[PDB]
Symmetry: C3
Subunit: 329 residues, 3 copies
């Protein structure tokens, strides 16, 4: 291949570049010098390592296509990405739509996705809510409970003094993260895998007896540490997949389309509702478990297919059918 596959040296670069190698591409990682050994020695998946944040000129010279990851908004910034001259796998317009809370809400509403109800006025609370002044977060049962806690925790003594808070329907369920891939080449959605994200200290507090917890003011945090593989109850799959289809269709109207990997981040309630908190409109690191395929890909492929490999398969096929320009922005 003339085209090389490149990505930032973090997040899911190991999986992405291995998938690229499996499909016959030469690979490029770019990032911190500290992590060069990870990608060239411990897991030798990068044919080139460039010790720079975003080496645009070198990437152009190497005929690179960049695969975006969660490290893109986090480490390079939306404006840098939107202005990049290196071909980008996916639609870079999606970045604003997934990052802006209001645009994301508009997207999910158009896609008919179940999300927590937002309350603009605390006096409209009729079911338990989570108040977001993940730090300082607390629950409120009703308006009366809210105002007592607004006084106790936030020092609010008058209703006109309440400012810059989020009030949201509290939705209790188990975290579930389905990983999708939409092929623009084949015009087809796939379920790639599913994971349960592993977070600290939130996933550690369950090991602490209530009695010991109550002696302290608990400071619950949601730092992402890793990922645990799961499968869903089979009868839940159709609605999870239909949700993915609706998200893609909505994006076709709103932002010029969505293709490649994405994830809907949410919880499953005891009433079997998938309620979505966030959309990640690119590869998520939960896919890293599935370098050797997943319980889902092995239902439909004769070989191991990670999301990383699936990306490289899409690029290769696009090249094979003279439509590479269709999958790049």
């Amino acid at each position: 291949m003339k085209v090389r596959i490149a990505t930032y040296a973090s997040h899911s670069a190991l999986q992405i570049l291995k998938g690229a190698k499996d499909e016959g591409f030469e690979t490029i990682a770019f990032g911190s010098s500290k992590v060069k050994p990870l990608y060239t020695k411990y897991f030798p998946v990068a044919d080139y390592f460039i010790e720079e944040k975003y080496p645009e000129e070198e990437l152009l010279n190497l005929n690179a296509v960049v695969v975006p990851t969660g490290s893109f908004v986090a480490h390079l910034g939306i404006e840098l990405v939107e202005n990049m001259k290196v071909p980008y796998f996916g639609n870079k317009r999606v970045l604003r739509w997934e990052s802006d809370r209001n645009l994301e809400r508009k997207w999910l509403k158009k896609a008919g996705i179940r999300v927590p109800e937002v309350y603009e006025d605390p006096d409209d609370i009729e079911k338990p809510v989570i108040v977001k002044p993940g730090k300082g977060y607390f629950l409120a049962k009703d308006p009366e409970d809210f105002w007592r806690k607004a006084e106790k925790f936030l020092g609010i003594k008058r209703k006109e003094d309440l400012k810059n808070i989020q009030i949201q329907e509290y939705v209790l369920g188990v975290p579930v993260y389905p990983h999708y891939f939409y092929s623009k080449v084949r015009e087809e959605l796939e379920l790639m895998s599913i994971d349960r994200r592993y977070e600290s200290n939130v996933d550690a507090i369950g090991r602490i007896p209530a009695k010991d917890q109550l002696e302290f003011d608990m400071d619950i945090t949601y730092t992402v540490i890793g990922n645990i593989p799961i499968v869903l109850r089979e009868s839940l799959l159709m609605d999870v997949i239909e949700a993915g289809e609706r998200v893609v269709k909505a994006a076709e109207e709103l932002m010029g389309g969505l293709w490649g990997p994405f994830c809907l981040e949410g919880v499953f309630t005891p009433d079997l509702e998938f309620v979505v908190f966030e959309i990640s409109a690119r590869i998520v690191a939960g896919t890293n478990i599935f370098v050797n395929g997943s319980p889902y890909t092995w239902l439909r492929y004769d070989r191991p297919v990670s999301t990383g490999r699936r990306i490289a398969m899409e690029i290769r096929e696009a090249i094979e059918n003279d439509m590479l320009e269709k999958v790049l922005t």
Copy 2:
């Protein structure tokens, strides 16, 4: 093959029909029209999809053998299954023995399986118990504690007024679900895999600080959402396997035998006791993780073997050795 493998379109049908395809069988799914795309498009494992609850005549015409799942008792009912004219993989007599609490208890007792002690009289309580009036469930330390709580939660003011409750030894341990397969063709038990079931809201409450929990009357639910793969400590395997052997042997006496997949559903205590709450005498959906084999099957096979594939292997071999009638009822 003349014989085709069929199952209801839910529970573990993806795994079952993929396993059938891997072994050279043509496949049939039957169920709700809503889920047809799951089995024909997103994961194309069904050669035929019949949009009916139980299309007996069509299944007979297609020379189907039906593989039972948890969706059978749940969605078709024991009487329908017992009367079905389509050949059934396994012993359909087991359905009553696994579903009737007293027959199940008799089975497990005969099989020398550790189960929670049942208390008929609350005044006989000498160790902590769980009271089942999973809703309304509460613990009691002793008879005095029980009667106070029976008054508080159930309104029982006189001992003669207590009616229709379950009182059971409370057993604290981590949920463990070993998946077995007994080959009637080979007269051999295998351990196929092990999972930890993922349930809502019960597996979500550990993420909630005690302080926040105590502000509400908690309503703990055990809705099944999915499955997480596990392995056991190696020194625990022999007793887990011996338990499986005893279950099979007991069934040979009581109900005309048990063969094919099954699962013992329970917990492991800190004293390394496997205590069983339920038997599922057919494929369990925890096996869905292991489409590409499991940490256990890869110890003894040179290829990926799911429980679904193992079922198809048994059927094929039965056909090969002219003993298909032995594995069907």
Copy 3:
């Protein structure tokens, strides 16, 4: 091969002996007669089974090399192992350094590994601590809190009466167990896999509502039941791997080297710190999940590589390059 691979019949023997078979070795398990069927029938990985605790003479006659596991210190004892005449895969000097709390502390300090701060004097407490009189364990905020609890729980009324306790910095994080392998043949460290150990009753208490917990004096236990596969956030890998490198380098100075499998047992904090509680300087049973390779080995191998197989690969290669004596003590 003339050399046969042997191990005690527990812990990770299934994985070890399967890995040995995959690499062309004949295999020996030795242990309890009760477990013979596990290794010869249910998972036929042992060519020879010797029904003895440590059959030295028979093992010498069979040209065995022994692969150590966690069952070695637990079931045979350090003195027996140090005196064994059968060739031992790894450095048997490491056993004291990993088992003696003070030697282990010295090792980890030399290796620049983050560990909980130890407090010799309770009056020096300035951050929350765990007190270890895992039974009887409690937390203390400060010296005043400690002495109140020392009186309440331990009956200590005078400061001079306090004896034989451990006081340690309390570190809240999610359990993480990276599995390493250092090849002496190749002079190279690998990350083999990562798991989250599954423990009872500690991992069951999160399913119990705070209200129900508080009615009882909780007795939290940490009995190991099994293992759950995980991957880490990719940006955390370099420091995890560097920690492994430092451990190996430190051992080269202190104890004549470390090679073969090992594990650093700890937690990841919300501030992305890996804090280590223990080192296990041999194969850990968390590797048992990865009989068919791991999300990490499949990044760098074209075939399934468990830690068990990796051990056999090292032995075979040592033989191939006439340096077997270098990997044995």
